[PDB]
Ligand binder design. Structure first.
Ligand code: SF4
Ligand code: SF4
Ligand SMILES: [Cl-]
Ligand SMILES: [Cl-]
Ligand SMILES: [Cl-]
Ligand SMILES: [Cl-]
Ligand SMILES: [Cl-]
Ligand SMILES: [Mg+2]
Ligand SMILES: [O]
Lengths: 598, 267
């Protein structure tokens, strides 16, 4: 047992192993210890994959890097490409033209919506929704619930819900349950009534059909999804109105706007209402676990400047909050060697001195797969990992030595803090949060005949429910922002500016003989940075610190826990052998393990 | 009639192939999962985790012995004693070999499973190895690309389920029905190539007229895929239509064939 960050860690209880953690991207192992009453008192995050992209990049052309690092992840597809071209542009002092800026912003906001909505329905929902309970639902009462949860959603008839229920019935009655096989159906951890389950399963299927439409925005500007193309100096999708011969003409821009308008309807009518409704019902059940580090320490680099290269205009303004003090946002500088640092004390890597954290411009990725003396099992057959030693392929990022949570929740807490200090660029997220708190506390309870509650945002946001809510609100805000970006792009083109690439420094003969750069992105899961050193036209060092690296990190030199481990602490389990609560909270971070390890 | 079980394993990967699969418009991935296959194991989508997830593999392999499909996304690493990819506390290669032994057919999804893709690019720190170099005694269909086109992935599944056969393969084990053409054969910019009409700098007048991308490093002339005709995301675009050269992403070792922006020699 030891105390850290206000958590009393104790490994004396019953050990539970979850390997694999499913409904994530990539490979994770989780172990917990539970006390005599099935309460988690210790949690261990193990990243169970590594590929070594940082090693592979050495000696290659900086102009090619975006395509290599894009393949860190096909779920957060393109955010690494964006970080990479930003890092190279930063190193070489390249300013991209306005149309390239706006097209990159539209592609980024398209990824946010697609990634968030697919996460919630296809990965997260089965932690809240019992599909077998959906089979017991009354189609008429499901119709009535749908009209209360989202009056504007046109797909609400008893007949519609009956037809979906009948397809689920036929599927289950076949005895081939496929993705539902060996599920935790009927666990007391599930609290939704049958009608809410059937509504959610219906929206799971709606989202699966619609998500493929949203990414056609990537296909227009970037050729394909997954893995759209980027370019150092701008975008490849040259503009010609008068013209079908150019990648981008008015017909292609009209097509993009049609896709954006569909996204805005989905976020407003399906996704946000479902998360408000499910959040309200789990709040009513008292399930406010999973706050972890969100109650104290949150970080984001800040993103979406409404004026390009002007960080004061970030529409998701960033920084760092410590100790739950929302009255003080510290500025975060990705260039400062004393701010972002990575430890490998408890990671399968080696440094000269593992008592220190390296800033990514000085970063080192040398693998060291070695298990501690207290391991149960062998090097190739682990029964119980030894978290006192090296236990993960994830490095341990810290900010000025502090363990931070990153992600949509971090950005929404930071936006709220900024708005309260008088930042007008954060007005929309503040409005969404106050609207959401009123719906969860008052409006939805009144509509469902449940008691009204008086939770503050300070109380509601640092929770697994709050983390899930912030992701849905961020999806909505990103759809609204890209709608504005589309108008600005078309207006700029119509005013006569058709430029899409700055090629002044394309040829490496023009480059300084050495340079360093950093590119940051508010990626779907939180704060992304790429740090590059260039020498004689080649990559000298390339280090990535990725959002799930922050959240999924193992303990640092001081033994401080990361966001995943903190979030699981002090959570009761209905059945320690069914990881329902573990999955619900881990999934609320939207873990991307290929991202975390790269 | 039972729907053929699919056990979809994930090794070292980025999950682009799983994402591409659900972009399919014809057929819908929804209809494939509910009505065509039984997707019984898939880390991305499955309800069960940990012990409950791993218990599915033995159940399906017993009940459907020699009558399930093994689909592999990603690849096994041979370095770090295989523990640069751990599933259930054991090397991924042990899971791959176990599930492969009683499969009717093996699909190598994407360039990772087919050839190695980005993790196998020099200097391949994990010794990431394609499936067909580990599983040498089972019929394997390679579906390369980073990722493959959505309709190519669902087209392979549809053929295999309709006919209970692997489609005709080329010498490299790729389905001829999707990989018989080079990008350059039917690329809509080919008339520009034939006239010596090329982009020389990004966003030059030639780029705005959709001139050929050969001199910007397009690897279409040496790359077999359906991108020029089938195209991407229900035929919306492809790399070249949106203004970037083909980087050769369906070809073995495309990461180590020089800069994406260096033109091919001997036009
Ligand atoms: S753009 Fe590429 S594939 Fe198309 S004609 Fe030119 S070289 Fe061939
Ligand atoms: S055009 Fe070339 S790079 Fe683009 S997806 Fe097709 S094969 Fe891959
Ligand atoms: Cl940018
Ligand atoms: Cl979510
Ligand atoms: Cl090692
Ligand atoms: Cl060891
Ligand atoms: Cl390859
Ligand atoms: Mg890194
Ligand atoms: O892949």
């Amino acid at each position: 047992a030891y105390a850290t960050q206000g958590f009393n860690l104790d490994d004396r209880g019953r050990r539970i192993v979850v390997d694999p953690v499913t409904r994530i991207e990539g490979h994770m192992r989780c172990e917990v210890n539970v006390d005599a009453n099935n309460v988690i008192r210790n949690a261990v995050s193990t990243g169970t994959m590594w590929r070594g992209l940082e090693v592979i990049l050495k000696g290659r052309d900086p102009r090619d890097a975006w395509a290599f690092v894009e393949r860190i992840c096909g779920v957060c597809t393109g955010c690494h490409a964006l970080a990479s071209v930003r890092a190279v542009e930063n190193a070489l002092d390249i300013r991209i033209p306005k149309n390239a800026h706006l097209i990159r912003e539209i592609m980024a906001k398209t990824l946010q919506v697609h990634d968030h909505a697919v996460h919630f329905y296809h990965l997260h929902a089965l932690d809240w929704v019992d599909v077998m309970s959906a089979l017991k639902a009354d189609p008429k009462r499901t119709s009535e619930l749908q009209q209360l949860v989202s009056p504007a959603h046109p797909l609400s008839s008893a007949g519609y819900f009956r037809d979906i229920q009948n397809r689920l019935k036929r599927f289950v009655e076949s005895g081939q349950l496929g993705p539902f096989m060996n599920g935790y159906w009927g666990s007391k951890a599930y609290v939704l009534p049958p009608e809410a389950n059937l509504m959610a399963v219906t929206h799971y299927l709606e989202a699966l059909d619609l998500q493929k439409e949203w990414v056609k925005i990537h296909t227009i500007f970037g050729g394909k999804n997954p893995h759209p193309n980027y370019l150092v100096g701008g975008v490849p999708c040259a503009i010609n109105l008068d013209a079908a011969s150019a990648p981008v003409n008015m017909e292609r821009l009209s097509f993009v706007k049609a896709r954006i308008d569909e996204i805005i309807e989905f976020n407003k009518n399906v996704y946000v209402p479902d998360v408000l409704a499910i959040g309200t019902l789990y709040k009513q059940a008292g399930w406010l676990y999973g706050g972890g580090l969100a109650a104290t320490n949150v970080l984001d680099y800040g993103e979406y400047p409404n004026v390009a290269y002007n960080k004061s205009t970030d529409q998701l303004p960033g920084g760092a909050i410590l100790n739950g003090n929302w009255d003080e946002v510290f500025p975060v500088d990705p260039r400062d060697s004393q701010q972002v640092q990575e430890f490998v004390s408890h990671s399968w890597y080696k440094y000269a001195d593992e008592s220190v954290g390296l800033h990514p411009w000085d970063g080192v990725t040398e693998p060291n797969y070695v298990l501690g003396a207290n391991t149960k099992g062998t090097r190739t057959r682990i029964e119980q990992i030894d978290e006192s030693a090296k236990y993960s392929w994830i490095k341990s990022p810290r900010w000025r030595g502090h363990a931070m949570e990153v992600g949509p929740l971090s950005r929404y807490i930071l936006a709220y803090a900024h708005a309260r200090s008088g930042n007008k660029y954060a007005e929309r997220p503040k409005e969404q949060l106050e609207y959401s708190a009123q719906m969860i506390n008052s409006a939805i309870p009144k509509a469902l005949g449940l008691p009204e509650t008086q939770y503050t945002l300070k109380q509601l946001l640092p929770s697994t429910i709050g983390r899930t809510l912030a992701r849905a609100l961020e999806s909505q805000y990103c759809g609204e922002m890209m709608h504005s970006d589309w108008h600005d792009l078309v207006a700029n083109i119509r005013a006569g500016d058709t430029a899409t690439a700055n090629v002044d420094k394309w040829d490496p003969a023009t480059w300084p003989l050495q340079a360093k750069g950093v590119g940051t992105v508010a990626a779907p899961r939180g704060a992304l940075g790429h740090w590059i050193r260039i020498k004689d036209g080649r990559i000298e060092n390339y280090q990535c610190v990725v959002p799930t690296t922050w959240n999924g990190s193992p303990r640092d030199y001081k033994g401080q826990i990361g966001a995943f481990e903190a979030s699981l602490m002090n959570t009761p389990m209905v059945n320690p052998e069914q990881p329902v609560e573990i999955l619900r909270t881990l999934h609320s971070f939207d873990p991307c393990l290929a991202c975390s390890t790269h | 009639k039972p729907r053929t079980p699919v056990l979809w394993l994930h090794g070292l990967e980025c999950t682009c192939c799983s994402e591409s699969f659900i972009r399919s418009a014809h057929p819908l991935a929804k209809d494939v999962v509910l009505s065509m296959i039984s997707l019984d194991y898939d880390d991305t989508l499955m309800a069960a985790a940990g012990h409950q997830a791993e218990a599915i593999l033995e159940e399906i392999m017993t009940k459907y012995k020699g009558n399930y499909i093994l689909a592999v996304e990603g690849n096994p690493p041979l370095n770090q004693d295989g523990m640069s990819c751990i599933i259930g506390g054991r090397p991924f290669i042990e899971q791959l070999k176990y599930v492969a032994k009683d499969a009717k057919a093996i699909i190598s999804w994407g360039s990772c499973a087919s050839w190695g893709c980005v993790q196998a690019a020099k200097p391949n720190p994990t010794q990431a190895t394609p499936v067909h170099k580990v599983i040498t005694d089972k019929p394997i269909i390679k579906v390369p690309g980073c990722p493959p086109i959505a309709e190519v992935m669902t087209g392979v599944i549809t053929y295999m389920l309709t006919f209970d056969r692997i489609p005709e393969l080329d010498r490299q084990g790729r389905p001829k029905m999707f990989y018989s053409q080079r990008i350059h054969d039917k690329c809509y910019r080919r008339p520009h190539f034939d006239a010596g009409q090329f982009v020389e700098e990004w966003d030059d007048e030639s780029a705005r007229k959709g001139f050929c991308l050969y001199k910007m490093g397009c690897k279409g002339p040496t790359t077999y895929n359906a991108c020029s005709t089938t195209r991407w995301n229900e035929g919306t675009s492809f790399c070249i239509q949106s203004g970037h050269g083909c980087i050769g992403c369906s070809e073995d070792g495309f990461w180590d064939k020089g800069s994406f922006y260096d033109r091919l020699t001997g036009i």
